């Protein structure tokens, strides 16, 4: 109630079914286009010219095999704008060159900025502390490291993940065979934060549900709660005793408990992001030098570490000619690593 | 194997032999653990965001809660008010019992399916196989991302236990 | 000898492993699903070669 | 010198000590193999 800025602010912040906000102006168009570009590409668009693959329902792929694939390696890290020097405003050619990939990755990046600005905006209006926005920095670090930094350190966008279920499976397997990414302690910390987070999610939900106060007559206990009630719905005291006696230690502070539930998965995703930044440069935890020196000199020395590099060597030689078509690899049968019989 | 690299060996061989990534029970396990992590962070952050002011700026807010106190330590109505607005009202829980049941159930059910993925690939009912599923008018194979997965699986298969197979099929 | 082909895999710290490569190695493919407690072995040395600790654990 | 009124005591409770030692010891257990390489 003043100038147009403040009238616009009023309208942006109306209490409605779908809150809009100033953040909504960035979020909505970007999220909409990222999602719609994904549905459009997976439904109708090929990857024949960029990868030599079919990738759409139109060509016969299913929900598991469709993708919006990255552009050809020859595109380098082109922004591949519709009006740019590659497509020169031709929508058809832009689709065939992988323009939907950078369209989705970049609108998706701006959309996540908008979602996180939305978390801050709504927190400020409702008067809560903005820890949800803070927690969301972990999704952001993962998206930015894997979809932007990783391919920026490599030769081109071609080596970013393609947006598809099987395409992402391929990306995992490539990181095993080429980066030995399972050996990387930043990935191991990610795995600890994800599995530890799922652990905390399960154990905290089960503990609350099993230390509930009898607050109703129902044998179905969900109705026996009121959002505005003053009282805890479950017994922290009994929960603490149970875990102290089962496991040896237990939470006693509910505030610490909930902060730790933020801390663990958020921290694990941030650690995995750092490992991927190293992989952008092929700065891998690929090897243990002492293992290689021993194994090179001692043909009877074998560990699970040397067994896994043999698997990686198989993955690289068998997958590279079709996975990296711009390399024009021809590997005669006689050079392919294979064990006996297989 | 009972070891860190042995675990990765088991995973890689399992992918060669069962195409686990393409198995919907492993996919449900992924949704279980990624979703468990997501809802863990969500819940932690929503409760933390709505802690009732009980401390000064020089003290950890954790001192604002005392073990065994009767009163809830955050405002769930405030948290629901935030999260119902972030998405939309009916996508948010205002019932703590329902919320906590969901927190238990989502990762527990997903991980049961992860476990049943391994326990049924134990009997060689394996991931979806779309190798050469897409064929052109003449009969040329048009590769999809499933075929590229296949090439990586083949690398694992031919190399694993390189001195142990004498005959052409790996049948266990 | 995890795969029963007389090709023993070193799992332990004192035999050249670190925390990341070390393992207790599964029992021998020659055993299969046979129950292999210590008293089934002629000696602790045989039991160790064949991956007895894995089953016990 | 007149006292500085911005000084505050610092605390680390026993649980925090244990959580912190566990973080450090487990980080060391994880990273030590890479340091020896």
């Amino acid at each position: 109630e003043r100038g147009w800025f403040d009238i616009l602010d009023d309208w942006l912040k109306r209490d409605r079914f779908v809150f809009v906000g100033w953040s909504g102006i960035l979020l909505f168009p970007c999220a909409y286009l990222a999602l719609g570009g994904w549905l459009t590409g997976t439904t109708f668009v090929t990857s024949w010219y960029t990868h030599g693959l079919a990738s759409s329902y139109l060509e016969g792929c299913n929900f598991l095999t469709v993708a919006v694939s990255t552009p050809a390696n020859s595109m380098g890290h082109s922004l591949l704008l519709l009006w740019g020097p590659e497509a020169q405003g031709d929508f058809t050619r832009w689709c065939q060159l992988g323009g939907l990939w950078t369209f989705i990755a970049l609108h998706g990046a701006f959309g996540l900025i908008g979602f996180m600005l939305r978390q801050f905006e709504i927190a400020r209006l409702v008067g809560v502390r903005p820890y949800n926005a803070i927690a969301f920095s972990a999704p952001i670090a993962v998206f930015v490291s894997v979809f932007l930094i990783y391919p920026l350190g490599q030769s081109s966008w071609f080596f970013a993940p393609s947006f598809g279920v099987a395409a992402i499976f391929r990306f995992l397997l490539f990181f095993q065979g080429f980066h030995n990414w399972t050996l990387n302690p930043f990935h191991m910390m990610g795995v600890a934060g994800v599995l530890g987070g799922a652990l905390l999610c399960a154990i905290h939900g089960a503990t609350v549900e099993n230390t509930l106060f009898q607050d109703g007559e129902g044998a179905s206990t969900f109705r026996a709660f009121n959002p505005t009630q003053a009282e805890e719905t479950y017994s922290m005291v009994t929960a603490n005793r149970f875990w102290s006696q089962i496991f040896g230690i237990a939470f006693s502070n509910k505030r610490w408990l909930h902060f730790f539930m933020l801390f663990v998965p958020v921290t694990g995703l941030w650690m995995s992001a750092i490992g991927v930044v190293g992989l952008a440069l092929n700065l891998r935890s690929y090897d243990f030098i002492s293992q290689e020196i021993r194994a090179a000199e001692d043909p009877e020395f074998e560990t699970f570490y040397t067994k896994n590099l043999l698997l990686n060597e198989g993955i690289r030689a068998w997958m590279a000619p079709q996975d990296q078509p711009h390399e024009n690899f021809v590997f005669p049968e006689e050079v392919l690593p294979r064990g006996n019989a297989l | 194997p009972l070891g860190i690299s042995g675990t990765f060996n088991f995973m890689i061989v399992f992918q060669a032999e069962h195409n686990i990534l393409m198995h919907p029970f492993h996919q449900l396990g992924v949704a279980g653990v990624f979703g468990g992590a997501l809802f863990c962070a969500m819940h932690g952050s929503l409760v933390t965001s709505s802690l009732i002011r009980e401390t000064t700026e020089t003290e950890s807010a954790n001192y604002g809660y005392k073990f065994g106190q009767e009163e809830e330590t955050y405002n769930i109505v405030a948290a629901h008010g935030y999260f119902g607005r972030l998405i939309f009202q009916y996508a948010s829980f205002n019932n703590s019992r329902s919320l906590h049941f969901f927190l238990a159930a989502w990762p527990v059910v997903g991980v049961w399916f992860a476990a049943l993925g391994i326990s049924t690939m134990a009997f060689n009912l394996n991931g979806f196989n779309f190798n050469h599923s897409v064929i052109d008018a003449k009969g040329n194979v048009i590769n999809t991302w499933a075929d590229i997965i296949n090439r990586a699986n083949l690398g694992m298969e031919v190399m694993h236990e390189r001195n142990a197979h004498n005959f052409p099929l790996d049948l266990a | 000898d995890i795969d029963g082909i007389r090709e023993p895999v070193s799992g332990s710290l004192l035999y050249g492993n670190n925390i990341i490569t070390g393992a207790v190695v599964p029992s021998s493919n020659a055993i299969g699903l046979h129950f292999y407690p210590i008293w089934e072995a002629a000696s602790l040395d045989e039991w160790l070669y064949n991956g007895g600790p894995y089953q016990l654990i | 010198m007149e006292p500085n009124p911005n000084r505050q005591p610092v605390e680390l409770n026993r649980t925090s000590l244990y959580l912190g030692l566990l973080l450090i010891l487990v980080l060391a257990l994880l990273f030590s193999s890479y340091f020896f390489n």
Partner: peptide, 29 residues
């Protein structure tokens, strides 16, 4: 020297478990 280091860190962690359980700050209502 590496085996010694790994086993030493491990032993410290098992000791830490013993104190964190039996010599925790007791929970007080």
């Amino acid at each position: 020297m590496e085996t010694i280091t790994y086993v030493f860190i491990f032993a410290c962690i098992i000791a830490l478990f013993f104190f964190a359980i039996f010599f925790r700050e007791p929970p007080r209502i």
